[PDB]
Amino acid sequence: MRECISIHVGQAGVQIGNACWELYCLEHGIQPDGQMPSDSFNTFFSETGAGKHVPRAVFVDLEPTVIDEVRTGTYRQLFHPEQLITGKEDAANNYARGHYTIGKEIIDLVLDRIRKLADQCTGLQGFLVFHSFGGGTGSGFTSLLMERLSVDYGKKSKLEFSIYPAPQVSTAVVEPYNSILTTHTTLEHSDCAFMVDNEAIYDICRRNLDIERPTYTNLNRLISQIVSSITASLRFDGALNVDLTEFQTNLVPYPRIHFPLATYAPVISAEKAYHEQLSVAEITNACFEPANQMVKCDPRHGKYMACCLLYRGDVVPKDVNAAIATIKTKRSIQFVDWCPTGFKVGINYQPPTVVPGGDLAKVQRAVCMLSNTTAIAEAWARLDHKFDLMYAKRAFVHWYVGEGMEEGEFSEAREDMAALEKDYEEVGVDS
Amino acid sequence: MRECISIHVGQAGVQIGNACWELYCLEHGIQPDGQMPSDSFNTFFSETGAGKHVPRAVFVDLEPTVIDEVRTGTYRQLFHPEQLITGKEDAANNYARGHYTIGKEIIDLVLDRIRKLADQCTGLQGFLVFHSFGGGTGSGFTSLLMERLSVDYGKKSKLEFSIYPAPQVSTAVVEPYNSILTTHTTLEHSDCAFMVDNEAIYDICRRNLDIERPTYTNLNRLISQIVSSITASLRFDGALNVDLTEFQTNLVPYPRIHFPLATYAPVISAEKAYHEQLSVAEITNACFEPANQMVKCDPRHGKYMACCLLYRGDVVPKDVNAAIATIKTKRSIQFVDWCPTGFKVGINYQPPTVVPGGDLAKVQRAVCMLSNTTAIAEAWARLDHKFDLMYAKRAFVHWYVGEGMEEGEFSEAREDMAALEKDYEEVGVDS
Amino acid sequence: MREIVHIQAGQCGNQIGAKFWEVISDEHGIDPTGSYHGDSDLQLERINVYYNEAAGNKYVPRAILVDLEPGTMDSVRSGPFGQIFRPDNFVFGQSGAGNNWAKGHYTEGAELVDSVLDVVRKESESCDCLQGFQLTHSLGGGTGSGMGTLLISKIREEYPDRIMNTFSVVPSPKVSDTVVEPYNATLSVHQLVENTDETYCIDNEALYDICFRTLKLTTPTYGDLNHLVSATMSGVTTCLRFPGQLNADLRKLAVNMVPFPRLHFFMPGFAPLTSRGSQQYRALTVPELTQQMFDAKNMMAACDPRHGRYLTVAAVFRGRMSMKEVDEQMLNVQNKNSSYFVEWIPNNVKTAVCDIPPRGLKMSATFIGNSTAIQELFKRISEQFTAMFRRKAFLHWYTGEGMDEMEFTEAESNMNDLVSEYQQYQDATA
Amino acid sequence: MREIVHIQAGQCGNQIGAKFWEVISDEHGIDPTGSYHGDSDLQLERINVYYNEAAGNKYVPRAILVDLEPGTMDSVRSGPFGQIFRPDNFVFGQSGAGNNWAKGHYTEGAELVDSVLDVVRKESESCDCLQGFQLTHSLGGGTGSGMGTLLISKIREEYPDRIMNTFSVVPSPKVSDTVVEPYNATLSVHQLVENTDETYCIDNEALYDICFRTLKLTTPTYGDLNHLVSATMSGVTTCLRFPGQLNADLRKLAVNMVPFPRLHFFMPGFAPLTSRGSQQYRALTVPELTQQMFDAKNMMAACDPRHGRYLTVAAVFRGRMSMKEVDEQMLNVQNKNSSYFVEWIPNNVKTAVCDIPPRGLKMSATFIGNSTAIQELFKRISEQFTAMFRRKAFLHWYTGEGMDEMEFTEAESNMNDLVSEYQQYQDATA
Amino acid sequence: GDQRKQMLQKYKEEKQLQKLKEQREKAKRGIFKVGRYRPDMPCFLL
Ligand SMILES: CC(=O)O[C@H]1C(=O)[C@@]2(C)[C@H]([C@H](OC(=O)c3ccccc3)[C@]3(O)C[C@H](OC(=O)[C@H](O)[C@@H](NC(=O)c4ccccc4)c4ccccc4)C(C)=C1C3(C)C)[C@]1(OC(C)=O)CO[C@@H]1C[C@@H]2O
Ligand SMILES: CC(=O)O[C@H]1C(=O)[C@@]2(C)[C@H]([C@H](OC(=O)c3ccccc3)[C@]3(O)C[C@H](OC(=O)[C@H](O)[C@@H](NC(=O)c4ccccc4)c4ccccc4)C(C)=C1C3(C)C)[C@]1(OC(C)=O)CO[C@@H]1C[C@@H]2O
Ligand SMILES: Nc1nc2c(ncn2[C@@H]2O[C@H](COP(=O)(O)OP(=O)(O)OP(=O)(O)O)[C@@H](O)[C@H]2O)c(=O)[nH]1
Ligand SMILES: Nc1nc2c(ncn2[C@@H]2O[C@H](COP(=O)(O)OP(=O)(O)OP(=O)(O)O)[C@@H](O)[C@H]2O)c(=O)[nH]1
Ligand SMILES: Nc1nc2c(ncn2[C@@H]2O[C@H](COP(=O)(O)OP(=O)(O)O)[C@@H](O)[C@H]2O)c(=O)[nH]1
Ligand SMILES: Nc1nc2c(ncn2[C@@H]2O[C@H](COP(=O)(O)OP(=O)(O)O)[C@@H](O)[C@H]2O)c(=O)[nH]1
Ligand SMILES: [Mg+2]
Ligand SMILES: [Mg+2]
């Protein structure tokens, strides 16, 4: 049937993949050793040997410490040894190192592994790519790999779950350079890219989950929950099923605008679940609140293009229709005039599952919300302003130049980014 | 059906709200943890979880002491954790601090909670606000909240329960400033405002209940009994039901005169209950004595404009009619000539319940009386006299001015209060 | 949440601070080693107002130890409750003011102020929501007065919106412990009238009188007076630490007690005070507390309230009692003594009730009064200053530190204007 | 996998290297005899970064001992941890520079540099994936400075793509340990500015200040100073040996902290630092560590960062923590000190977190700063150089080995250019 | 008496003027502190 291939690159991609695959083994009742203790999960797990299920995942990094941590973890006997590919020296937050110097040393091996994994598939539907913009290995290698995949396959859909840089929180100094370069070279090779902010998830954890020490594990668990909600329609059956192609058909109005934002609901703690009844209307309402979006940008500053709603568990279509209508009548949010119908819905019977020792309460229904809106133009402008600030004096440029990048690439990326902002402003004007 | 939302602001509001909610839970047989040990109370309680009831209450204060006392007490698991909103620094008996400097920091959060609670409601008809005039956060945040609610809704009713300053008893030096400022601000936003006097309640407990140590618990229990008698028509069915809108359409003849007086009967001790066979006629009589009033002002000094009677328990309509007729023929009290019919009567089946550990005996009939009279004019005049005494020398003015309030606001409030006195004296002249 | 930074300077400040911290620690059940050994949850519920929780269940008071000589705080450190303080907060010089305002304000204060402000900043940024500052010092000494005014000025510049509270030992009317105390007192009031939110004045002579007449103590020492002052401070700040039936913090007291910015000098008092033998013959009731508070003999300042009229009065009751009785006693006091209250202010009394009893008795009460009779203290100090200033006695000691006579004239003029304001505010004019 | 070659030259280099190797062996559970005796698998999973594996579980450090005199290494060998080093790595001459840069760079260094290079090549052949080189020396000495500059020159000519880190001991501002110190310092910076990827400056006076005022050490010796330097050395490269949430190797630090090739001089720091008695008076949290990082008194170089503007900052944390707390703390530092960071570099701070804390500590953090205030150190050294060069004092010692005044002029011109660049990068121009 | 009052008046102006001059340069750069991070209030759809 329909199958999906997942790729995790860099430290962020690898760790989010660890969380995702733990959740996946939990939901389908698969032990960490690959043996089921008691079948629509063949989309993600392939049957090899006698009752052993091997996930369809590829883990790539140019630095061996995180993959070595994976190889010695609880899921050591889960992944095929050849899917975990490692280098020797990381990109060191340098896009040129991960694109031109170090990436080209193992790109062929990564492509060979992906091809070998895909040839077995009969109904392959797309690729899932997890990475981060600010990273060197992340951005550089994902750009190179996406370009190679688009050259090779083209027709197959390709989806990203990237970590957008936060407006204030940062862990690197050369973040704008890599971010701009990778979005310039990725813009024409992608179909849909869901982005999250570490700062927004920190705020979600503090305000809703009442967690004062939100380590990376909690953020990765939330992102894994979003990905699981996205892929539930493939992994189960529902009153309204949505596959991967419909996402890009309904959320992407123009080829250069494929940057939706992903939220989730309900994000509540265990103690507060008793005092709240989790109805479809209230979670649908909460999905549109600016305080719940997991990108640090205000939706009220722009207008929505398209919206996608995915319901899990105890959900009845009439109430979903009523909630959507109520949202539409509300004037607090705004929609573009050239999009009279801006909603795509999906309903699935399987309720969300709770990882033991986690932080989310047990609920009978949940919502995943994806929105393509013009509010991200402000974030793009902020990134471009940082780029201009750091480029007027040629700061850090020699590091990139010494690895094989010509100085003209920075200018080309800046002009392409300006063009994208102009597109975002031209599409934001009613007729 | 029809629902109500209760708002408690300030120390006095929070304490009276705690007493009222304990009484409500006891009346309906709800355990402090929110469960039920065995259905018309959906007006105040919302069903959630597996047979758990969450009251429709919002608790606001700018200091954490009393709210933390509530969060630690016996009812810690009854209230929704997000419904108890708390600041960091209190107003400190400063109207300007509660209205301009500190109130603006959490007014948005309070309005969010109010809107979230109202959205859950299908037939919401009004809000209940508890506060005190003398306090800083009480008066200031009440005026700000009523301004915001009137802007937001406008058409829904907004009742008030306020602690009118006592003519002799005082616990603050800047009470007249706060009282005048809050009255000027809220005169054009409150549909109706019932008031009680701490001094009069002290006198009632001393004379009737035979208590010499009446801490605020007894006063709050009396006020809770009054509010229970008011809302019994919503919470229980009876021979003649009275809604919240009926109060304002029957008691308020002009938009600037909405300050009725609340009493209750019978108020007796357990030892004296056995020697008095209480009946409808004599409780109706007892509701009219100046000594039984809960505001320290003589009704005989003024003229009645409208009276509301609320009966609960074993009550026969014919006896009510006879008692009201006898009261009308009595010439010791006076009515305005332009109001030939000045009585509204309601009867409820459910008798009052006695809280264990309380100081009131068990009776099968009780009366709550609300009267709009011109006798409050002298109290208003006394407040104006105190304000004038304190304003000629600009005492404590710098405290208000340093928080952004202009000096002309005092003059505007004084002129408005003078206009109110003019209106009260003009409406009290027969023609 | 609402938290207070405590600073003490000079010998008197350090001694009263040590006694006050011992009082607070006993009240909250913290042993000298700093480990909580209490028996109630309310002791820990609001421990953050005064203490910082360190690793291993230890509590460090939020205090700063300031002095120009090392003897006093060396004695404090070597004594009991010396290991409880953080050693880094002990800030000492090496020269000493020598009972000289100029030497403590211009010559050594300038060197020590940078270090003390660095420590104050380090303490304040670690706070969550600062409520205000509190200072313990005197007016008759050199380092105490000079460094206290310097620190008050610098902190007022740094934090203009916080609350500044001072407990100052003003000079005694009859016996003087220094020959140059009028100079220091005047030069310190010249700064207190402008840079302090509110100030409580306590006299050693009134304390001696209280111990000898009320407590029937044969040989009162400085420990007893520091005990009384510490009890007063705890009573004042009790509404921040325990839940109350009607509660008031520092800012509420300031709002209700300072009608005009230049009149914030109060006279504190405590009730009940009784001897060991006379406790058996008296009943602890609210009327007894009220009658003891409004007693001229019971005031902690050597000024008679009957000479002037009260402006505002604050009574912070502690324990379990009925607010009806409190209100009736306040009414009785206002109506009986209607000749001692200003006409242009109704409701002269502000009342607060803290549920938890003081450590000790069942009931207690603290009294803070803002009376116009305190102008007599200022007038007497002005008379002594001018009697010593025409002859220019001891003036070279001050002018040798860079000060000039213009500063003395300005301070005297400001203090006389304050006296005139306090005097003329006894006019009803209505 | 990434491996690091360690070299130490001169007395200062040899002493700091011995202390560093004791620290490293203790962290990895290696006894002085070279046999693993740890209690965790993490101490062995990445042991090949610093130690080679010999036959029989014995571990040999990948270190090289170089000196022009045998006294210091004879002391090292006869002392403890002297049997871990391979005897073939001890290379020495018989003359000694005698605090003469020319002697160690042109006359004595030329004889030993071939042997040192031979040992370096032999060590690097056994390495699987070289990460770079690290070198410990002192600028103010003869053999240290001369041989260190010569070795960096030779290796940079050999492996230009690798990473060079040197932990230099720059001269102090107040008291100097050698008369000809300016000469050697200037001639060494002339080579460091063009042959080194990144350099950390260390001042003995800053170390004495930290020891006396923070550690409360009455008699600090050179052992304590080397202990502190070794702690910083271990903190820098912790991310190569243990797993963590956010990793960062040497190349990442070099990219994030070197905006222009000629500005690679940093000021290191460590936290926490407390005495034996005061550690019970504070909690162990992330904000206290952040306070200790950005403390000018905690810097390990005698340069005040308040006098300049930071270019980039690196914070490397160790231990179980929360990323949100770290990020909010760094944000607060950046916004609240907005005046001390350059406007044309947004997000001046780079962050790394490692899971394994130092043995016996809950958490630790290392601070590395690229501040323009180092220009004051360079300016001072250049000023002393010029003042001693007009009179041609002590010049005949250096010119008697082959050097000429043109080399000195080139060195002073280069230092002036570097100071000019550092000053010019404090201009907004926007 | 009037001349002495004028001398006092002059002294007061000079004092305040050096105070403003002293505070002018002090507020230019600032001071080094750390404190804690203070979260911003959430935005709402109201
Ligand atoms: C035998 C007995 O039970 O006597 C009581 C007592 O209540 C009496 C005698 C106490 C006692 O105080 C004195 O004798 C005294 C002597 C000189 C100066 C001041 C007081 C007592 O010390 C006071 C003490 O009070 C307390 O419980 C509080 O802890 C007290 N703190 C301390 O005494 C203290 C001393 C050292 C270190 C830490 C705390 C306190 C008082 C007010 C506000 C806060 C705390 C108690 C039990 C008594 C004695 C022991 C006799 C009194 O104390 C106060 C300040 O309330 C004296 O005035 C009251 C009258 C009381 O009847
Ligand atoms: C109960 C407790 O905390 O004991 C500590 C201790 O008291 C203190 C004062 C230690 C102690 O350090 C010093 O006294 C000291 C003296 C001069 C220079 C530097 C340190 C300690 O020696 C240091 C030692 O720390 C370690 O063991 C670290 O792993 C450290 N290793 C060594 O110092 C070491 C010593 C001998 C041989 C090999 C290593 C380390 C630090 C950073 C990076 C790698 C290793 C410990 C537990 C203590 C003592 C013993 C008193 C401190 O050590 C450090 C840098 O962590 C000083 O600052 C900390 C704060 C600690 O509280
Ligand atoms: N949400 C989340 N973000 C992460 C996680 N790990 C890393 N990141 C993000 O990644 C950014 C740092 O760049 P990395 O993705 O680690 O770069 P890299 O993939 O390691 O590639 P190199 O820098 O060349 O080693 C940070 O800004 C983080 O926001 C994670 O576990 N969860
Ligand atoms: N009936 C009754 N009145 C109360 C009670 N508690 C406080 N009050 C009244 O409240 C007045 C004091 O002002 P508060 O209501 O406490 O002021 P606040 O709401 O806390 O606002 P702030 O001034 O900022 O503290 C007193 O004069 C009392 O009349 C109570 O429990 N019952
Ligand atoms: N040397 C010195 N003496 C002081 C200082 N402050 C006050 N004094 C003197 O101490 C006397 C009383 O202070 P003290 O006995 O400590 O006050 P008490 O014990 O709290 O009542 C005053 O009259 C002052 O003259 C100071 O800072 N230094
Ligand atoms: N921190 C530290 N510094 C040292 C040590 N030994 C020497 N130094 C410094 O090194 C300088 C002397 O240089 P030195 O190495 O003796 O000259 P060289 O032998 O010719 O290289 C002096 O200024 C000392 O401050 C040490 O063990 N620790
Ligand atoms: Mg990496
Ligand atoms: Mg209050």
Residue numbers in the entry:
A (entry chain B), B (entry chain L): 1 to 38, 47 to 439
C (entry chain K), D (entry chain A): 1 to 430
E (entry chain C): 87 to 132
Could you share sentences copied from the article?
The dynamics of kinetochore-attached microtubules are regulated by hepatoma-upregulated protein (HURP) and the mitotic kinesin-8 Kif18A, but the underlying mechanism remains elusive. K-fibers also recruit Kif18A, a member of the kinesin-8 family that walks towards and accumulates at the plus-ends of K-microtubules.
We next used cryo-EM to determine the structure of HURP1-285 bound to taxol-stabilized microtubules under saturating conditions. We observed two structural motifs for MTBD1. The deep insertion in the inter-protofilament groove and the bridging interactions between adjacent tubulin subunits are consistent with HURP’s role as a microtubule-stabilizing factor. Cryo-EM imaging of microtubule-bound HURP revealed how this MAP associates with microtubules through a bipartite binding motif that stabilizes adjacent tubulin dimers by forming lateral contacts. Our structural model suggests that this function could be exerted by laterally stabilizing protofilaments, and attenuating their peeling at the microtubule tip during catastrophes, therefore increasing the likelihood of rescues. Additionally, HURP partially overlaps with the microtubule-binding site of the Kif18A motor domain, indicating that excess HURP inhibits Kif18A motility by steric exclusion.
